[PDB]
């Protein structure tokens, strides 16, 4: 909880500027997860 030599703040920052290149653009990422278990499933959404 102090700033000085041998002390480093953990939260850096992105400088997301449109003038940047493709390599430094920002990306919105979303990630899903699925698993198989005992009790009968609920999230179905099958065919038509």
């Amino acid at each position, epitope marked *: 909880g102090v*700033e000085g030599f041998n002390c480093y703040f953990p939260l850096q920052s992105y400088g997301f500027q449109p003038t940047n290149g493709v390599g430094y653009q920002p990306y919105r990422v979303v990630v899903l997860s699925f698993e198989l278990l005992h009790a009968p499933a609920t999230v179905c959404g099958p065919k038509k």
Partner: antibody, heavy 122, light 108 residues
Framework: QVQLVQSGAEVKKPGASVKVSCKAS????????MHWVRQAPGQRLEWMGW????????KYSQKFQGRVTITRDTSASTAYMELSSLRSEDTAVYYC???????????????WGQGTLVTVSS | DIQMTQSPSTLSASVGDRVTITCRAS??????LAWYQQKPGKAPKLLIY???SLESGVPSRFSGSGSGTEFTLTISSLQPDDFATYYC?????????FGQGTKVEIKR
């Protein structure tokens, strides 16, 4: 409820410098966002800059570049503003704003100081 | 820099009515905006952010809308506490600007 309070009235003279400051009272300091804005009387509001009450970051305006400075004191939980080379225009009312809380930064002012009056006269 | 102008310099009304405000931008804004209420001789109070969201602790009357450039605020019933100016803030880019001021009155 978060509240912000700050100094009283000031009067100065051309060429001088003035130091206004506002004290914070927030439930947590999750990279708090004291964030200054000013208003010439009967005019459009004008935005000063934002200090990163988390650590030290100091993004400033551009019309006011190179003459205004901002700091803060961690223990007192206050925010410090400083302006030099004043002139008759900057006669205004000065405001503290900021205080996101849920997320760490915004750019909209949701907790406003009750106002500081500055008069540049000769 | 981004320019912000408000279409109504002043707005007339009477108690228990609806009003609308227009905030136009010189350039495209991706629904980044907020609406502040400022009574005379006080400090600004925020109402709407991100052009849609309703910030807590306010009456439910207030409501934002709009996207792109033309942006709109609207209240259903006009209560006494609505008698003051209203500003629009852009925050699409750097140096963040403000509107002009849109002030209501009490018609008689």
């Amino acid at each position: 409820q978060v509240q912000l309070v700050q100094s009283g009235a000031e009067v100065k003279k051309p060429g001088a410098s003035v130091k206004v400051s506002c004290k914070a009272s927030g439930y947590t300091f999750t990279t708090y966002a004291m964030h200054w804005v000013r208003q010439a009387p009967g005019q459009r509001l004008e935005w000063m800059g934002w200090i990163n009450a988390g650590n030290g970051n100091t993004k400033y305006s551009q019309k006011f570049q190179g003459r205004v400075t901002i700091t803060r004191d961690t223990s007192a939980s206050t925010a410090y503003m400083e302006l030099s080379s004043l002139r008759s225009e900057d006669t205004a009312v000065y405001y503290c704003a900021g205080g996101g809380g849920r997320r760490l930064q915004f750019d909209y002012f949701d907790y406003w100081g009750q106002g500081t009056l500055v008069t540049v006269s000769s | 820099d981004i320019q912000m102008t408000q279409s109504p310099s002043t707005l007339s009304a009477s108690v228990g009515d609806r009003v609308t405000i227009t905030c136009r931008a010189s350039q495209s804004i991706s629904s980044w905006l907020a609406w502040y209420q400022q009574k005379p001789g006080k400090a600004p109070k925020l109402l709407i952010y991100d052009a849609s969201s309703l910030e807590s602790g306010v009456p439910s009357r207030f409501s934002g809308s709009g996207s792109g450039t033309e942006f709109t605020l609207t209240i259903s019933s006009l209560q006494p506490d609505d008698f003051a100016t209203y500003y629009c803030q852009q925050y699409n880019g750097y140096p963040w600007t403000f509107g002009q001021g849109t002030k209501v009155e009490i018609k008689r």
